[PDB]
C-alpha cells in the first residue's frame, strides 16, 4: 500500500515505471489473468495450515514423512 500510494496517477496508465508493479495490487484483471496479490496470499495460508498440522502434536518426525510421500 505504501508502493500503491505514490503511483496511482500517470503523472489508468502510469507514466512512471511503477506500471507493472501496480498491476498486482488490484488491477481489475480484465482477461489478463496471470495473478493478483489477493489470490497469492491465500496460497500461503494453505501451506500455513499444513505446516501447522504436522507440528500439531502428532509426532512431527512421523507426520512429516507422512506428508513427504504425498509430494
Amino acid at each position: 500500500n505504501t508502493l500503491a500510494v505514490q503511483g496511482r496517477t500517470g503523472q489508468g496508465p502510469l507514466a512512471t515505471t511503477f506500471g507493472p508493479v501496480l498491476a498486482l495490487m488490484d488491477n481489475q484483471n480484465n482477461s489478463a489473468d496471470m495473478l493478483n496479490l489477493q489470490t497469492y496470499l491465500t496460497r500461503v495460508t494453505q501451506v500455513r495450515l499444513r505446516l501447522q498440522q504436522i507440528a500439531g502434536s502428532s509426532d512431527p518426525q512421523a507426520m512429516m514423512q507422512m506428508l513427504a510421500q504425498t509430494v
Binding site: Q28, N29, S31, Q38
Partner: protein
C-alpha cells in the same frame, strides 16, 4: 396535414429524443458493471 402526425407520434417519441438529452447529461453508462461492493466482481462469480 402531416405535422399533426409528426407531433402525435412524437407524443411517444419526442420524449425519446428527450431521453437522448438526458442520456448525454448522464455519464452513467452501464453503471460501470452494476457495482456491487468492495468485492472484486472480476475474479470470479460472473466475473466478466
Amino acid at each position: 396535414l402531416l405535422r399533426h402526425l409528426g407531433t402525435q407520434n412524437s407524443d411517444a417519441m419526442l420524449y425519446q429524443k428527450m431521453l437522448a438529452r438526458v442520456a448525454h447529461q448522464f455519464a452513467d453508462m452501464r453503471l460501470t458493471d452494476m457495482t456491487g461492493d468492495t468485492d472484486v466482481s472480476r475474479l470470479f462469480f460472473t466475473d466478466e
